[PDB]
C-alpha cells in the first residue's frame, strides 16, 4: 500500500524518515540483502529502526513471536495491549 516504497535503499529510507515529524513514521521496503523479503524502517525520536519482516513455515508475517516466560510477564504485557481480538480490554483488582 501507500507505506510501501519498494526498492528505496536503506540509506535513503533513513534520509526520508529522518525528515519527518512524529515517532512511528514508517515505511516497508524490500530487504537489502534478502530476495523476496521485506524491511520495516521506523522513525523513532533520533534514529530509524529497521525490522526484518519475519515469515514462518505457513507463510505468515510477523515481527516477533509474542510468548512469555511467566504469568507476570503475560499480565504486564496485556496492561497496555488488549487481551481481546475484537474489543479493547486491559486490567485490575
Ligand atoms: N523483526 C526483527 O527484526 C526483530 C529483530 N531485531 C531487533 O531487535 C532490531 C530492532 C530495531 C532496533 C535494533 C534491533 N533490529 C535488528 O537486529 C537488525 C539490525 C540492523 O538494522 O542491522 C535488523 C535488520 C537487519 C538488516 C536489515 C536489512 C536487510 O534485510 O538486509 C535491510 O535494511 O534491508 C534490516 C533489518 C534485523 C535483524 C534480524 C534478526 C535475526 C534473523 C531472523 C530471521 C531471518 C534472518 C535472516 C538473515 C539474517 C538475520 C535473520 C534478529 N533481529 C530481530 O529478530
Ligand atoms: N488480522 C487480524 O487481526 C485477523 C485475526 N487474528 C487475530 O485476532 C490474532 C492476531 C492479532 C491478535 C489477536 C490474535 N491471530 C489469530 O487469530 C490466530 C490464532 C490465535 O489463536 O491466536 C490466527 C493464526 C492461526 C494460525 C497460525 C499458524 C498457521 O497459519 O498455520 C502459524 O503459526 O503460522 C497463525 C495465526 C488465526 C486466524 C483466523 C481468523 C478467523 C478467520 C477469518 C477469515 C478466514 C478464516 C478462514 C479459516 C479459518 C479462520 C478464518 C481469526 N483471527 C483473526 O481474524
UniProtKB/Swiss-Prot annotation:
Transmembrane segments: none
Main location: nucleus
Record's GO cellular component terms: cell cortex; cell-cell junction; centrosome; COP9 signalosome; cytoplasm; cytosol; endosome; extracellular exosome
Residue list for modification N6-acetyllysine: 52
Record's comment on post-translational modification: Ubiquitinated by RNF173, leading to proteasomal degradation and inhibition of the RAF/MEK/ERK pathway. In the nucleus, polyubiquitinated by RBBP6 at Lys-52 at DNA damage sites.
Ranges of residues in domain SH2: 3-93
Localization, UniProt: Nucleus; Cytoplasm; Endosome; Golgi apparatus
Claim: Repeat is one of the keywords in the record: yes
One GO BP: insulin-like growth factor receptor signaling pathway
Disulfide bond residue pairs: none
Keywords: Acetylation, Cytoplasm, Endosome, Golgi apparatus, Host-virus interaction, Isopeptide bond, Nucleus, Phosphoprotein, Repeat, SH2 domain, SH3 domain, Ubl conjugation
MF annotations from Gene Ontology: ephrin receptor binding; epidermal growth factor receptor binding; guanyl-nucleotide exchange factor adaptor activity; identical protein binding; insulin receptor substrate binding; neurotrophin TRKA receptor binding; phosphotyrosine residue binding; protein kinase binding
Domain of life: Eukaryota
Crosslinked positions (Glycyl lysine isopeptide (Lys-Gly) (interchain with G-Cter in ubiquitin)): 52
Entry annotated with the keyword Phosphoprotein: yes
Known function: Non-enzymatic adapter protein that plays a pivotal role in precisely regulated signaling cascades from cell surface receptors to cellular responses, including signaling transduction and gene expression. Thus, participates in many biological processes including regulation of innate and adaptive immunity, autophagy, DNA repair or necroptosis. Controls signaling complexes at the T-cell antigen receptor to facilitate the activation, differentiation, and function of T-cells.
Family membership noted in the UniProt record: Belongs to the GRB2/sem-5/DRK family.
Assembly behavior: Homodimer. Associates (via SH2 domain) with activated EGF and PDGF receptors (tyrosine phosphorylated). Interacts with PDGFRA (tyrosine phosphorylated); the interaction may be indirect. Also associates to other cellular Tyr-phosphorylated proteins such as SIT1, IRS1, IRS2, IRS4, SHC and LNK; probably via the concerted action of both its SH2 and SH3 domains. It also seems to interact with RAS in the signaling pathway leading to DNA synthesis. Interacts with SOS1. Forms a complex with MUC1 and SOS1, through interaction of the SH3 domains with SOS1 and the SH2 domain with phosphorylated MUC1. (Microbial infection) Interacts (via SH3 domain) with hepatitis E virus/HEV ORF3 protein.
Swiss-Prot/TrEMBL domain comment: The SH3 domains mediate interaction with RALGPS1 and SHB.
Protein name, per record: Growth factor receptor-bound protein 2
Organism of derivation: Homo sapiens
Gene: GRB2
Residue span relative to the full protein: 58 to 150 of 217
Amino acid at each position: 500500500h501507500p507505506w510501501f516504497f519498494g526498492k528505496i535503499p536503506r540509506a535513503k529510507a533513513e534520509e526520508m524518515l529522518s525528515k519527518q515529524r512524529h515517532d512511528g513514521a514508517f515505511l516497508i521496503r524490500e530487504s537489502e540483502s534478502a530476495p523476496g523479503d521485506f524491511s520495516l524502517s521506523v522513525k523513532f525520536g533520533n534514529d530509524v529502526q529497521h525490522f526484518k519482516v519475519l515469515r514462518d513455515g505457513a507463510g505468515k508475517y510477523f515481527l516477533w513471536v509474542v510468548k512469555f516466560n511467566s504469568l507476570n510477564e503475560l499480565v504486564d504485557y496485556h496492561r497496555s495491549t488488549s487481551v481481546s481480538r475484537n474489543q479493547q480490554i486491559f486490567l485490575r483488582d
